RNA sequence: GCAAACCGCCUCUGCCCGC
RNA sequence: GUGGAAAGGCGGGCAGAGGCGGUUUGC
């Protein structure tokens, strides 16, 4: 279809690539600041009623990366029939360890075509050491801290399908609030800050009965081929319970997803994002 | 509640070699961006040095500030280091691993302390988030081009240790940034309350004014700091900016002003529209 | 033997240092490469390793003579200061290249005795490049000069002089 | 325990190299043809300078030896010097004992107190600071790097020699055979703008920490700085511009409320001289 | 009548302690 | 309605000790 690719040009390190549960909570806190409580309940009713956002994925200078579908591995020897077996084996193994794909190679793996993995990941996971200095005696106490450090042109982006009146009413004023506060991590050390641009992405996808999830799933029914993701965040200092999501690129069949509202002892109810972002996919026999 | 974000842009001038180590081919390397290889000043080495200077400033003025800032009445000047008991009567009340920091223990007290209202507090059942965001200062476009022109951006300096009797020399090397460099800093204050933000800006400029006469990181007492704040612009970014997106923020103009020609030289003048729109 | 050792780009850095530690073989084959350096009158004649190829053939022929570095330091430190001016300080070395030509001319006007040939061959090489540098830019085409003049002195320490 | 802050006594001025100064570096930094044993240089401007490390350590070197001369005369005025006896830990390779030079840095013994409150009563380690396990007392002076003053910037533009090359020859006495080497040195008469910032922490003892910093300054104009000073190369002379005080109300207001002492024509032995109390009497009126 | 020879560096040190 | 909130990689450490720009004799 036609999606609105919201790009996040970084201005420092991150803490992690944002997922969809920790983008929607950040969009929730951004709307309550500039609009209030009655619009956050309207935001949640817009996602359930209409289109929903996806997880964040890297890019590197007009090479929008997307997750590798899990639809390829039970086909991954039929994908590579026309190869000689001494190089076909190590191609098949590096094809499976791969996490992301290009915007073009994603459209091949949706059709069970031969595809190639990218050569380079647009970021690194460095471990910057900090220190805690005593105020009188200047005594040091090293702890370690890890980050995500992007390259010269690289960044991160997510996708939005939905009505345009919900986008420029809610998603677009929230992403400029979040350009000056963080997306997770030590935002007081300048981590989750960025500059936002809006573009247009178009993905060619085959119409089918199945679909891949470009965000966290929290499924209703049991999916087809999946990969478990287990995380629960924090909400105003309250520790969220861990929830079995499904990682991105996993395969569902006619599943809308669904958010779980939580209590956590706060004044307001906390919604946790688990709507899926379906793109059509072709499967083998299971 | 959110009202706007006072944004502070400018430059950091390393008048003397600045060293912020990493301890990982020079024997003591300054930290570097892993993709470019360029040095930078973190946002966390800048913030903990703005805070360590300001906490000793409050430590001397506990008695004189009992009635402008409450919850400085629960602190005695000094550390809790000898009697190993946290949140005691003395000021530097929280032990982290082996160091003692003033961190207020509750939300109800950190809204009154001048350090923790501006810089944040951890607490138990508290979690007071800070109001400033200190970004990582990177080299200015003029100094990334000197990296393109083949210059050296980080020298390597050799010291020595000499016996007081027999003059046995014992040297070591310390990489440090070439003096004269220009960084680009960014501090984004978060206007939560509309009443006490003048006291939070005037305390942040006091922490910077103490930083221009102390050092930034490194050896410092042997002359490795000597930093200088060169402000460019202050912007307000109102609440009406974030909803409708139209560009009507309030921008102060200070191209060449100091940290002391800005604190009271123009404080009634430069923030004239910001104090009017609130 | 020496001409086959003195090949195109880096024919024998390890080999010529053993032969220069000789008389009749290097008085001819390096003389052709000294004439090849003078026949390359343009300083920008070598974007490749040929600046690193000429300077090995130069500093092997000069190491056969004396070439005290101490005599040349007035020129060598002068080349250091003029490159220091290029860092946004000045852009015209023409008022001081003439001094650097004069200090090159004063040095051979002093160097008398057994060390005439150690400064005559040194006089032969830099001056057709200083002819070009009179009417040239100074950020470019002087960048290639000062890097050539470093490699002359640098291999001269490796071949065992100074 | 109890670190406070009242202000920063700032000591500016100029350093006159009456005899030519040589603070040596190492070479090999993409440099090919040069004088052996070069003076250290600012890599951005090209000019020589004096490190704060070379000046804070040289003032520490002369003052620690001044205190080792009198360990029975300062101990009536400072505690914790009774823990130390005159000597070194060179005849017995043990770090902390009764000898006054106690820290083996790598091989050289330097008086650094091992604790906070031992160093809080030491006349050396409260002015220059100390390292330790669990105490780590930090310093109260910071000495910055001293570049050429603004008029000697302009003499470099005019083409005057800011350095020179002195050749010294060592002669074997029996065969009278010279062994020549060339030493770069800053030209005599050159002038460097320096900076010493004292950090006023305890208002009970701050007279002494200025009377001990001005004691080590007067010992340095009698001794030499950098170089091979037993062969000429030292002879530093301190030319003060202005003491200033910078009270705590300066950093909060921004008004010029500093108490500015004037010794624009005085000498380092004249500030310690009768008049110390005539010049710092308005600092005591502010505290 | 004025020089021309040799010597152009030598030899000791090089990150500790503290989380 | 953000796997979050708080957290200076730094405290101390002279690039230093020794050293006549010299002597010899001829072409
Ligand atoms: Zn507090
Ligand atoms: Zn001591």
| Alpha-carbon separation of residue D127 from D21, D51, D102 (angstroms) | 26, 18, 17
D122 is in an annotated binding site: yes
Cβ of D33 and C84 within 8 Å? no
One DSSP character per residue, C111-127 reads --STTSHHHHHHHHHHH
| Alpha-carbon separation of residue A47 from A271, B272, C59, C130, C140 (angstroms) | 11, 43, 77, 75, 61
Query: Of the candidates C42, C34, C16, which has an alpha carbon nearest to the alpha carbon of residue C120?
Result: C34
Chain D contact for C107 (CB, 8 A cutoff)? no
- Sign (positive/negative) of CA torsion C119, C121, C125, C131? positive
Tell me how far apart the alpha carbons of residues D238 and D193 are, in angstroms, rounded to a whole number: 10
One DSSP character per residue, A215-226 reads S----SS--SB-
Task: Please answer whether residues D217 and D268 qualify as being in contact, where contact means their C-beta atoms are separated by less than 8 angstroms.
Answer: yes
One DSSP character per residue, A187-207 reads GGGT-S-EEEEE--EE-----
Beta bridge partners of B32: B39
Minimum CA–C1' distance nucleotide for A230: F3
Q: What are the φ/ψ torsions at residue D15 (nearest 5 degrees)?
A: -115, 115
CA–C1' A186–F5 (A): 9
Tell me how far apart the alpha carbons of residues B192 and D104 are, in angstroms, rounded to a whole number: 54
Breaks in chain B follow which residues, C to N over 2.5 Å? Answer: 24
Query: 3-class SS at D174?
Result: coil
Q: Which helix (H) or strand (E) holds C153?
A: helix C143-158
Side-chain-side CA neighbours of D49 within 13 Å: the count stands at: 25
B196 is in an annotated binding site: no
Tell me how far apart the alpha carbons of residues B183 and B217 are, in angstroms, rounded to a whole number: 15
Q: Which helix (H) or strand (E) holds D249?
A: helix D248-253
Tokens 């020549």 sit on residue: D180
Query: Do C and D have ≥3 inter-chain CB pairs under 8 A?
Result: yes
Tell me how far apart the alpha carbons of residues C56 and B48 are, in angstroms, rounded to a whole number: 54
**Residue A20 backbone class (left: φ over 0; alpha: ψ -120 to 50; beta: rest):** alpha
| Alpha-carbon separation of residue D244 from B220, C118, D9 (angstroms) | 20, 61, 6
Structure tokens, C61: 């022929």
User: Which chain D residues touch B264 with a CB distance below 8 Å?
Assistant: 253-255
Tell me how far apart the alpha carbons of residues A124 and C101 are, in angstroms, rounded to a whole number: 53
Tell me how far apart the alpha carbons of residues A257 and D59 are, in angstroms, rounded to a whole number: 73
Tell me how far apart the alpha carbons of residues A14 and A151 are, in angstroms, rounded to a whole number: 12
Resolution as reported, in Å: 3.1
Closest ligand by atom to D96 CA: 2
CA torsion D82-D87-D92-D95 (nearest 10°) is: 50
Experimentally, the structure was elucidated by: cryo-EM
| Alpha-carbon separation of residue D283 from B93, D271, D279 (angstroms) | 33, 15, 9
Minimum CA–C1' distance nucleotide for B173: E15
Cβ of A134 and B98 within 8 Å? yes
Tell me how far apart the alpha carbons of residues D209 and D124 are, in angstroms, rounded to a whole number: 9
CA distance D125 to chain A (A): 13
Cβ of D182 and C80 within 8 Å? no
| Beta strands B132-134 and A270-272, pairing class | unpaired
Query: Of the candidates A11, D248, A235, A172, which has an alpha carbon nearest to the alpha carbon of residue B7?
Result: A11
Task: Please answer whether residues C124 and C38 qualify as being in contact, where contact means their C-beta atoms are separated by less than 8 angstroms.
Answer: yes
Cβ of D134 and A136 within 8 Å? no
Structure tokens, B203: 């305390």
Tell me how far apart the alpha carbons of residues B116 and B137 are, in angstroms, rounded to a whole number: 23
User: Which chain D residues touch A135 with a CB distance below 8 Å?
Assistant: 3
Beta bridge partners of D13: D194, D240
Task: Please answer whether residues D134 and A139 qualify as being in contact, where contact means their C-beta atoms are separated by less than 8 angstroms.
Answer: yes
Residues 6+ apart with CB under 8 A from D246: B213, D7, D8, D9, D10, D258
Q: Chain A interface residues facing chain B, Cβ-Cβ under 8 Å? A: 11-13, 33-35, 124, 126, 128-130, 132-137, 139-141, 143, 149-152, 172-173, 176-177, 180-182, 186-190, 193, 236-237
Q: Which of D32, D34, D35 is opposite residue C154, by nearest beta carbon?
A: D32
Cβ of B179 and D44 within 8 Å? yes
Structure tokens, A243: 């929830």
SS (H, E, C) chain B: CCCEEEEEEEEEEECCCCCCECCCCCCCCECECCCCCCEEECHHHHHHHHHHHHHHHHHHCCCCCCCCCCCCCCCEEEECCCCCCCCCCEEECEECCCCEECCCCCHHHHCCCHHHHHHCECCCCCCECCCEEECCEEECHHHHHHHHCCCCCEEEEEECCECCCCCCECCEEEEEECCCCEEEEEEEEEECCCCCCHHHHHHHHHHHHHHCCCCCCCCCCCCCCCEEEEEEEEECCEHHHHHHCCCCCCEEECCCCCCCCCCCCCHHHHCCCHHHHC
Structure tokens, D143: 């000495």
CA angle B156, B138, D193 (to 5 degrees): 50
One DSSP character per residue, A129-183 reads EEE---TTT----EEEEE-BEE-SSEEEEEEE-S-HHHIIIIIHHHHHHTTTS-S
| Alpha-carbon separation of residue C63 from C1, C9, D223 (angstroms) | 18, 19, 45
Minimum CA–C1' distance nucleotide for D175: F23
Tell me how far apart the alpha carbons of residues B196 and B207 are, in angstroms, rounded to a whole number: 17
Q: Which helix (H) or strand (E) holds A275?
A: none
Query: What count of other Cβ atoms lies within 10 Å of the Cβ of residue A107?
Result: 18
Structure tokens, B95: 């032990």
Ion ligand 1, residue ranges at CB < 5 A: B 104, 113, 115-116
Query: What count of other Cβ atoms lies within 10 Å of the Cβ of residue C93?
Result: 22
Tell me how far apart the alpha carbons of residues C85 and C94 are, in angstroms, rounded to a whole number: 12
Structure tokens, B185: 């800093």
Tell me how far apart the alpha carbons of residues D263 and A258 are, in angstroms, rounded to a whole number: 78
Q: Which of D33, D46, D182 is opposite residue C76, by nearest beta carbon?
A: D33
Length, in residues, of chain B? 278
Q: What are the φ/ψ torsions at residue D247 (nearest 5 degrees)?
A: -70, 175
For testing contact with chain A, the best of B39, B99, B188, B192 (most A CBs within 10 A)? B99
What separation in Å is there between the alpha carbon of D111 and the centre of ligand 2? 6
Chain B 147-166 residues in 7 Å CB range of strand E: 158, 160
Tell me how far apart the alpha carbons of residues D216 and D61 are, in angstroms, rounded to a whole number: 9
Query: Of the candidates D69, D83, D95, D65, which has an alpha carbon nearest to the alpha carbon of residue D121?
Result: D83
Residues 6+ apart with CB under 8 A from D167: D180, D181, D182, D183
Query: Of the candidates D254, D202, D258, which has an alpha carbon nearest to the alpha carbon of residue D9?
Result: D258
Beta bridge partners of D239: D14
Query: Of the candidates A108, A76, A111, A110, which has an alpha carbon nearest to the alpha carbon of residue A90?
Result: A76
Protein-covered nucleotides of chain E (CB closer than 7 Å) are: 3-10, 12-19
| Alpha-carbon separation of residue D116 from B14, C10, D136 (angstroms) | 31, 62, 6
Q: Which of C77, C84, C154 is opposite residue D34, by nearest beta carbon?
A: C77
Structure tokens, A39: 């619009």
What separation in Å is there between the alpha carbon of D124 and the centre of ligand 2? 5
| Beta strands B154-159 and B251-253, pairing class | unpaired
One DSSP character per residue, D128-168 reads S----SS--PPPSEEE--EEE-HHHHHHHHTT--SEEEEEE
Task: Please answer whether residues D145 and B179 qualify as being in contact, where contact means their C-beta atoms are separated by less than 8 angstroms.
Answer: yes
Tell me how far apart the alpha carbons of residues A23 and A174 are, in angstroms, rounded to a whole number: 11
What separation in Å is there between the alpha carbon of C154 and the centre of ligand 2? 49
Structure tokens, D234: 């030292």
Structure tokens, A94: 């590096």
CA torsion A161-A167-A173-A178 (nearest 10°) is: -10
D44 is in an annotated binding site: no
Query: Of the candidates D237, D57, D13, which has an alpha carbon nearest to the alpha carbon of residue D146?
Result: D13
Tell me how far apart the alpha carbons of residues A111 and A283 are, in angstroms, rounded to a whole number: 8
Protein-covered nucleotides of chain F (CB closer than 7 Å) are: 1-23
Structure tokens, A240: 């969220």
What is the distance, to the nearest Å, from the Cα of residue D218 to the centroid of all Cα atoms in its chain? 11
Cβ of D32 and C70 within 8 Å? no
Structure tokens, B136: 């990582």
Cite the DSSP H helix spans in D33-147: 52-69, 116-119
Query: What count of other Cβ atoms lies within 10 Å of the Cβ of residue A2?
Result: 8
Q: Which helix (H) or strand (E) holds A62?
A: none
Cβ of A35 and B237 within 8 Å? no
Structure tokens, A125: 């996971």
Cβ of D25 and B220 within 8 Å? no
Minimum CA–C1' distance nucleotide for B97: E19
Q: What are the φ/ψ torsions at residue A101 (nearest 5 degrees)?
A: -145, 165
What is the distance, to the nearest Å, from the Cα of residue D136 to the centroid of all Cα atoms in its chain? 21
Tokens 């195109």 sit on residue: C8
Q: Which helix (H) or strand (E) holds D171?
A: strand D163-171
Q: Does nucleic acid strand E have an atom less than 7 angstroms from the CB of D36?
A: yes
Nearest residue to F3 (CA, C1')? Answer: A233
One DSSP character per residue, C30-79 reads HHHHHHHHHH--STTS-SSTHHHHHHHHHHHHHHHS---HHHHHHHHHHH
Tell me how far apart the alpha carbons of residues B109 and B103 are, in angstroms, rounded to a whole number: 10
Q: Which helix (H) or strand (E) holds D4?
A: none
Domain limits, chain C: 22-162
| Beta strands B76-79 and B90-92, pairing class | parallel
CA–C1' D168–F21 (A): 6
């Amino acid at each position: 279809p036609k999606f609105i690719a919201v790009k996040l040009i970084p201005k420092g390190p991150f803490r992690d690539i944002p997922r969809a549960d920790t983008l929607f909570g950040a969009i929730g806190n951004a709307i309550s600041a500039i609009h209030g409580q009655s619009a956050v309940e309207e935001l949640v009713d817009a996602f359930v009623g209409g289109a929903r956002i996806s997880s964040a994925f890297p890019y590197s200078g007009d090479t929008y990366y997307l997750p590798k579908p899990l639809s390829v591995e039970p086909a991954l020897e039929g994908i590579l029939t026309g190869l000689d077996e001494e190089e076909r084996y190590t191609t098949a193994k590096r094809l499976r360890k791969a996490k992301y794909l290009d915007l073009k190679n994603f459209e091949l793996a949706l059709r069970l075509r031969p595809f190639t993995i990218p050569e380079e990941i647009p970021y690194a996971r460095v471990d910057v050491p900090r220190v805690v200095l005593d105020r009188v005696t200047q005594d040091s106490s090293i702890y370690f801290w890890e980050e995500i450090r992007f390259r010269e042109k690289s960044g991160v982006y997510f996708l939005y399908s939905g009505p345009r009146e919900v986008f420029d009413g809610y998603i677009a004023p929230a992403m400029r609030f979040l350009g000056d506060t963080g997306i997770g991590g030590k935002s007081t050390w300048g981590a989750g800050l960025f500059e936002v641009e809006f573009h247009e992405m178009k993905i060619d996808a085959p119409g089918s009965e199945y679909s891949v999830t470009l965000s966290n799933a929290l499924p209703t029914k049991t999916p087809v081929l999946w990969r478990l993701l287990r995380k629960g965040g924090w909400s105003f200092g309250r520790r969220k319970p861990r929830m079995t999501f499904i990682a991105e690129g996993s395969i569902v069949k006619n599943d809308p997803g669904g958010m779980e509202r939580l209590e956590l002892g706060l004044s307001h109810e906390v919604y946790v994002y688990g709507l899926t972002f379906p793109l059509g996919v072709e499967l083998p026999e299971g | 509640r959110f009202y706007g974000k006072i944004v502070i842009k400018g430059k950091i001038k390393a008048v003397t070699g600045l060293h912020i180590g990493s301890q990982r081919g020079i024997a003591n390397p300054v930290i570097k961006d892993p993709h470019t290889g360029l040095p930078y000043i973190p946002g966390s080495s800048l913030k903990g040095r703005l805070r360590s200077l300001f906490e000793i400033l409050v430590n001397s003025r506990l008695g004189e500030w009992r009635e402008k800032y409450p919850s400085l009445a629960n602190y005695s000047p000094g550390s809790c280091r000898p009697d190993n008991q946290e949140n005691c009567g003395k000021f530097f009340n929280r032990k982290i691993n082996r160091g003692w920091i003033h961190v207020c223990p509750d939300y109800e007290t950190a809204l009154a302390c001048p350090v923790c209202r501006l810089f944040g507090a951890s607490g138990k059942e508290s979690n007071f988030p800070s109001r400033i965001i200190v970004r990582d200062a990177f080299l200015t476009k003029e100094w990334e081009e000197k990296w393109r022109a083949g210059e050296a951006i980080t020298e390597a300096k050799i010291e020595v240790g000499i016996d007081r009797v027999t003059s046995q020399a014992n040297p070591r090397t310390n990489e440090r940034v070439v003096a004269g460099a220009e960084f680009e800093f960014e501090i984004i204050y978060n206007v939560e309350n509309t009443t006490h933000w003048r006291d939070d800006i005037k305390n942040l400029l006091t922490a910077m004014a103490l930083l221009e006469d102390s050092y930034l990181g490194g050896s410092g007492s042997r002359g490795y700091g000597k930093v200088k704040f060169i402000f460019d612009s202050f912007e307000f970014r109102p609440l009406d900016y974030y909803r409708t997106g139209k560009d009507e923020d309030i921008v102060s103009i200070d191209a060449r002003e100091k940290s002391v020609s800005d604190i009271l030289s123009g404080f009634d003048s430069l923030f004239s529209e910001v104090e009017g729109k609130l | 033997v020496d001409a086959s050792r003195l090949f195109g780009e880096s024919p024998d850095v390890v080999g010529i240092k053993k032969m220069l530690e000789k008389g009749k073989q290097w008085e001819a084959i390096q003389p052709y490469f000294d004439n090849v350096v003078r026949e390359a009158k343009n300083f920008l004649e070598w974007s490749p390793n040929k600046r690193l190829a000429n300077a090995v053939t130069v500093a092997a022929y000069l190491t056969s003579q004396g070439l005290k570095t101490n005599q040349v330091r007035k020129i060598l430190d002068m080349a250091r200061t003029t490159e220091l001016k290029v860092k946004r300080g000045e852009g015209d070395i023409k008022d001081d290249l003439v001094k650097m030509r004069y200090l090159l001319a004063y040095t051979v006007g002093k160097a008398t005795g057994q060390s005439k040939y150690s400064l005559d061959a040194f006089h032969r090489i830099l001056d057709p490049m200083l002819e070009v540098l009179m009417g040239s830019p100074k950020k470019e085409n002087f960048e290639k000069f000062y890097d050539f003049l470093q490699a002359v002195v640098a291999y001269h320490k490796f071949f065992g002089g100074g």
